Design an enzyme around this catalytic site. Structure first.
Site, PDB file in Angstrom:
ATOM      1  N   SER C  34      64.657 100.926  41.965  1.00 47.28           N
ATOM      2  CA  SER C  34      64.834 100.053  43.131  1.00 47.28           C
ATOM      3  C   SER C  34      65.220 100.871  44.067  1.00 47.28           C
ATOM      4  N   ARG C  35      64.013 101.244  45.288  1.00 45.04           N
ATOM      5  CA  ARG C  35      64.151 102.181  46.258  1.00 45.04           C
ATOM      6  C   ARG C  35      65.090 101.490  47.360  1.00 45.04           C
ATOM      7  N   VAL C  36      65.424 100.461  47.351  1.00 38.75           N
ATOM      8  CA  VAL C  36      66.272  99.602  48.130  1.00 38.75           C
ATOM      9  C   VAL C  36      67.491  99.682  47.911  1.00 38.75           C
TER      10      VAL C  36
END
Lengths: 337, 265, 85, 48, 236, 120, 170
Positions: C34-36
């Site tokens: 999850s690159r958030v």
């Protein structure tokens, strides 16, 4: 070979060496080079052009350009058109070298044409008669009969391996037609071997038939030595047999020796000495880091001390036992210093 | 995909084949030194054995064992482990001194009480008198070895150049030397404490020999094992090659069909 | 799958082998990102689980090495033991 | 001092011609540890 | 060829080069005709085209056409349909190898990879078959034996085993014909050895009658008669 | 006969006279001798097989006339010529070392050995 | 199994063994054996025929032939026609046998036909009705109910598996 690993760089090295022969009056020594830039950015070719101008190679160079922007019909006809230019030189009995770079982009353009002409596409979605195109093109390179005038049109097609894939349809076809292959290798590139040519996977079907007799004499050994070095390469990773270890010493020094700073070619009359040294195994006594310094120094030592030898090697083009004797003496003397 | 996952795994197998080949060769190199040593050591031992025989040796207890820290040298570790366990049925109360991590671990599980002394920093090196002497010296001081009137040592007798049999022998205590009857058919009075000196002396001479025999068997086993591995890897290479080739064809066919179907419309 | 992967902000791969290995629900967190970042993660859990990722990542490397069963150093076996738990 | 310690030490001293084969020197000096096992329990691996 | 066979009543031998490029050409003509390219691209008429072609290659009552064809395997995929279809039509395969040429043995034939379906106790004779089988067994055992014999030592050979190794290495050398076309090319006078004398030669070697003539006195030497001379020269 | 055997080497493992330095002083053996067991001290040794003599410096060992006249010397590696200056320099350091530190005994063996070396 | 592992030979041996039984006078010991040669060289068949006539096995056996030269629709119709002859024996209530050598080459033939009819390729480019062909062919080989006669027609269809990987559609 491997995608843009200075594929063009490997090619460019040849063109520079053709300057030396070109300067000479003889038109068998005037190979009028053609680089055929297919689907290549105008900036990239501008850099190429600029580099060529820098090495003054423009005065026998022809750059047939079908740029990336230039459309697929032009690209389709680009090697064929270039070949016709070559016929004029060849017909005049002169020699020339045409480097088709890269047929991989030529294929795609033909793919674009065929699919758009709704023709059924061949294997790996590359037109079925792409083979027919390649066979026509690649068979035009010919060394003509003495009767119909000795001329030639040497060719060196460039195929871009899609992640090193050589089983692909466009490579397989081309591999069959070609008389030799040179296969660049990524590991070698990484291991700082520039040229990164993997000579195991390089082959020539013309090979020793052409090459200086002198260089042939002093490089039969080289093939055999390197062959052992390759096999005993994997034995390089402990407590190792003396025989293997000797091979490793000779072999490793050779591997360093065949490194060459790209965009610098060497004169054959000095190539023969460097390999000769290796043949006489006097380079076994030279430290790996010091191979490079040794090399240039050895060349300068030969240039001052034994420029008689250099001129003899060049002009005789052959090595007499007496010439090899004197050459050995020179190598020994330099090796001592 | 399939094709690439096959290919990377096949590359692993290729690398394994190459490594197991390489290992077998390096093992051979080491084996030569091991064998050379073993002769000289064994000759010294035989002269002492001539004494023990002629002496009529007349043999808590000790168990000593020898294997290396490292593994992958035959079934040296676990065949010896099974045979120690057998002789730990033969003496439950014996104190096991384990020379080698691999034998140490297996026995440590079966009885951890019996593990009393253990030795590290031997296994990666070839047998040497210096080591043998020190181990012996520590055996005497730490384990009070003479108190235990039976000692037994385990090692690997290198039965054939293709085999290793784990083997044991009994080290001859000062008690043993004492009660040897034809000891008296060697002259000594009380001038020297020949039992107390000779015991110490044969503790090391026997131990060094056992180590030399063991090391040779171990390194030979490693060579043998690594050879058989190379063969197994070849078979797997062939199996994945057929899979690779078939897989390649299937992908081509499936792709072609999609294009054709599109073209047909 | 290719189309969706681009659209989404994370992928939560579950591995079948790991289902069998006993994580039920299974996971496969090497193929889960999850690159958030740690946005929309409770603050407490952000503090505590800070090196949970490092431990697991180290565990992943270490476990592979452990399968080859080479003579392991204590540092790797600290990781291995920690990772397993 | 132990008899076998005595001979060992003598051999080590005697390899001090002054210049000797590497294998001799190595055979007279190799590093090791002894991990005593008090039980399971075990005094720390320490230079033998 | 058929004009020769049928209308000149004479046996012929017809070489074909790559049959891969025969296939490739056929495949293209299919695609040009717009016909659905059958599996692995190859034409749907792949089988039939070979079928017609290689049944016009036959022994008629008036002649026989032998054909030597060259099979350019596509990346050594024998699995691929085009080689398979070819191998069905093919009766024998001669498998030249470079290892063999590197052993200085000309012909370059790899003897453990050359097979014909006319090799039989019936077809080529029981004697011929038995002689061949023994020689094959000898070579087969020899190669396998050399694997660990070389590594372990030649002394590991028993008297029987080294009898075989000696015989095998003698046979291996005996195989090389300094043949006539390559009289110039190798530099050594040719040897054309008749079929009857070939069988005879191997029978004698099987009885080890020339196991007193070293292996290098058969190197680049023809038949049994020939190595009588070479035996004399070896001594002299 | 005699068997003189080292761990790393082997010497005589026929030998008509052997001269050995032992806890019983110095011993010479010719043919049958009493079937003794004596610990050999660090030594300057002469071994003679026939009249021909080869001279060894030995780091001590054990001596055993087997009751079958097979002389057996088992000893730990030192050759006389191989041992035979640096040790004297070393001994000066080692003597200093006795002051601080088993090492006292080590240096003590070394002085015994140096004196014995000086004998050659 | 794999190509020319004496592929033909296995069937030949059955025919030969059933010489003594077949040369019996008992009609319940009469096999009438049919060798369907599909995709096979006409030369090879002629050698086979000569072999059969040497063992005089020809007199109780039929050979149906659809050689490699012979065109694909004929090859397509070759098993079906052969089976009709077998049914005549079957409908004599008399035992028969049929060897369809090689039914794998028949599959290729039907594949060719399908492609040349521009009918969509199936898996491995063999049409989806390749199954239908085989199932219809094979289930026409039976030993009928005793009321309807005891006429067998034993089927031995000979499949030439490339690679020997029998996880293959055909």
């Amino acid at each position: 070979g491997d995608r843009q690993t200075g594929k063009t760089a490997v090619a460019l090295d040849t063109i520079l060496n053709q300057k030396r022969w070109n300067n000479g009056s003889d038109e068998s020594k005037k190979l009028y080079c053609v680089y055929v830039a297919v689907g290549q950015k105008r900036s990239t070719v501008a850099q190429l052009v600029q580099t060529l101008e820098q090495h003054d190679a423009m005065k026998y160079s022809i750059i047939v350009a079908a740029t990336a922007s230039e459309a697929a019909p032009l690209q389709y006809l680009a090697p064929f058109t270039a070949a016709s230019i070559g016929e004029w030189f060849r017909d005049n009995g002169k020699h020339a070298l045409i480097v088709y770079d890269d047929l991989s982009k030529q294929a795609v353009a033909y793919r674009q044409l065929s699919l758009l002409l709704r023709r059924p596409p061949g294997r790996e979605a590359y037109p079925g008669d792409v083979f027919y195109l390649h066979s026509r093109l690649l068979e035009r390179a010919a060394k003509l009969s003495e009767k119909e005038g000795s001329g030639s049109l040497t060719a060196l097609p460039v195929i871009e391996t899609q992640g090193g894939d050589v089983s692909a349809y466009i490579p397989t076809n081309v591999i069959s037609i070609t008389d030799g292959q040179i296969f660049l290798e990524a590991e070698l590139f990484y291991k700082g071997i520039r040229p990164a040519i993997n000579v195991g996977l390089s082959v020539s079907r013309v090979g020793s038939a052409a090459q200086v007799k002198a260089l042939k004499q002093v490089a039969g050994s080289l093939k055999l030595f390197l062959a052992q070095y390759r096999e005993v390469a994997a034995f390089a990773q402990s407590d190792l047999d003396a025989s293997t270890k000797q091979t490793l010493v000779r072999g490793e020094r050779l591997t360093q020796l065949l490194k060459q700073n790209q965009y610098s070619p060497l004169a054959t009359e000095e190539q023969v000495p460097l390999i000769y040294a290796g043949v006489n195994g006097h380079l076994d006594g030279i430290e790996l880091s010091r191979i490079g310094e040794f090399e240039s120094s050895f060349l300068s030592y030969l240039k001052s001390n034994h420029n008689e030898l250099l001129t003899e090697i060049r002009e005789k083009g052959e090595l007499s036992k007496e010439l090899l004797a004197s050459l050995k003496s020179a190598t020994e003397s330099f090796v001592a210093t | 995909a399939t094709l690439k996952e096959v290919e990377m795994r096949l590359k692993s197998i290729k690398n394994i084949e190459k490594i197991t080949k390489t290992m077998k060769i390096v093992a051979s190199t080491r084996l030569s030194k091991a064998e050379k040593a073993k002769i000289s050591a064994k000759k010294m031992d035989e002269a002492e054995q001539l004494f023990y025989k002629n002496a009529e040796t007349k043999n808590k207890e000790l168990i000593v064992a020898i294997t290396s820290d490292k593994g992958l040298c035959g079934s040296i570790h676990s065949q010896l482990a099974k045979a120690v366990r057998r002789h730990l049925n033969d003496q439950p109360n014996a104190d096991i001194v384990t020379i080698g991590d691999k034998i140490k671990m297996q026995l440590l599980r079966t009885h951890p009480n019996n593990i009393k002394l253990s030795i590290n920093g031997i296994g990666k090196d070839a047998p040497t008198f210096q080591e043998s002497a020190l181990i012996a010296d520590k055996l005497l001081s730490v384990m009070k070895a003479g108190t235990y009137p039976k000692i037994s040592i385990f090692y690997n007798d290198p039965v054939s150049s293709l085999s290793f049999e784990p083997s044991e022998k009994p080290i001859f205590n000062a008690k043993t030397i004492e009660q040897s009857p034809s000891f008296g058919k060697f002259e000594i009075d009380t001038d020297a404490n020949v039992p107390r000196d000779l015991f110490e002396y044969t503790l090391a001479n026997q131990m060094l020999t056992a180590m030399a025999q063991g090391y040779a068997a171990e390194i030979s086993a490693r060579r043998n094992a690594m050879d058989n591995a190379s063969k197994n890897a070849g078979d797997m290479i062939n199996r994945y090659s057929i899979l690779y080739n078939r897989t390649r064809q299937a992908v081509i066919t499936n792709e072609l069909v999609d294009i054709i179907t599109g073209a047909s419309s | 799958p290719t189309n969706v992967i681009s659209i989404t902000d994370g992928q939560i791969f579950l591995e079948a082998e790991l289902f069998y290995k006993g994580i039920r629900p299974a996971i496969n967190v090497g193929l889960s990102v999850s690159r958030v970042g740690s946005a929309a993660q409770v603050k407490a859990l952000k503090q505590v689980a800070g090196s949970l990722k490092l431990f697991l990542a180290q565990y992943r490397e270490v476990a592979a090495f452990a399968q080859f069963g080479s003579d392991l150093d204590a540092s790797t076996k600290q990781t291995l033991v920690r990772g397993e738990r | 001092i132990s008899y076998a310690a005595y001979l060992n030490v003598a051999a080590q001293a005697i390899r001090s011609t002054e210049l000797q084969t590497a294998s001799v020197l190595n055979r007279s000096q190799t590093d090791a540890f002894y991990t005593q096992y008090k039980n399971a329990s075990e005094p720390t691996p320490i230079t033998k | 060829a058929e004009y020769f066979r049928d209308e000149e009543g004479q046996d012929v031998l017809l070489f074909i080069d790559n049959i891969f490029r025969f296939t490739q050409a056929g495949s293209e003509v299919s695609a040009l005709l717009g016909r659905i390219p059958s599996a692995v691209g190859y034409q749907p008429t792949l089988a039939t085209d070979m079928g017609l072609l290689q049944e016009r290659i036959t022994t008629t009552k008036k002649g026989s056409v032998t054909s030597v064809q060259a099979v350019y395997v596509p990346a050594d995929d024998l699995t691929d349909p085009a080689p398979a279809t070819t191998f069905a039509h093919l009766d024998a395969t001669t498998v030249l190898s470079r290892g063999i040429s590197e052993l200085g043995i000309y012909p370059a034939v790899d003897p453990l990879d050359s097979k014909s379906r006319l090799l039989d106790a019936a077809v080529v004779g029981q004697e011929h078959y038995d002689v061949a089988s023994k020689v094959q067994e000898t070579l087969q055992t020899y190669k396998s034996l050399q694997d660990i014999i070389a590594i372990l030592g030649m002394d590991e050979l028993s008297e029987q085993d080294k009898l075989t190794v000696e015989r095998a290495r003698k046979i291996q050398r005996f195989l090389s014909q300094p043949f006539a076309v390559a009289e110039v090319f190798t530099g050594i006078p040719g040897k054309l050895v008749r079929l009857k004398d070939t069988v005879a030669s191997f029978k004698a070697v099987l009885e080890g009658k020339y196991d007193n003539i070293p292996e290098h006195a058969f190197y680049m030497v023809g038949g049994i008669e020939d190595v009588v001379a070479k035996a004399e020269k070896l001594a002299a | 006969k005699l068997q003189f055997a080292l761990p790393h080497e082997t010497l005589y493992s026929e030998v008509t006279q052997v001269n050995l330095p032992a806890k019983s002083g110095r011993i010479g053996v010719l043919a049958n001798h009493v079937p003794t067991v004596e610990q050999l001290l660090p030594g300057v040794v002469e071994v003679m097989e026939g009249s021909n003599s080869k001279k060894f410096f030995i780091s001590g060992g054990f001596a055993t006339v087997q009751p079958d006249s097979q002389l057996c010397v088992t000893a730990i590696e030192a050759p006389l010529e191989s041992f035979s200056e640096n040790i004297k320099n070393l001994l000066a350091e080692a003597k200093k070392n006795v002051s601080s530190s088993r090492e006292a005994a080590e240096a003590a063996i070394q002085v015994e050995v140096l004196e014995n070396l000086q004998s050659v």
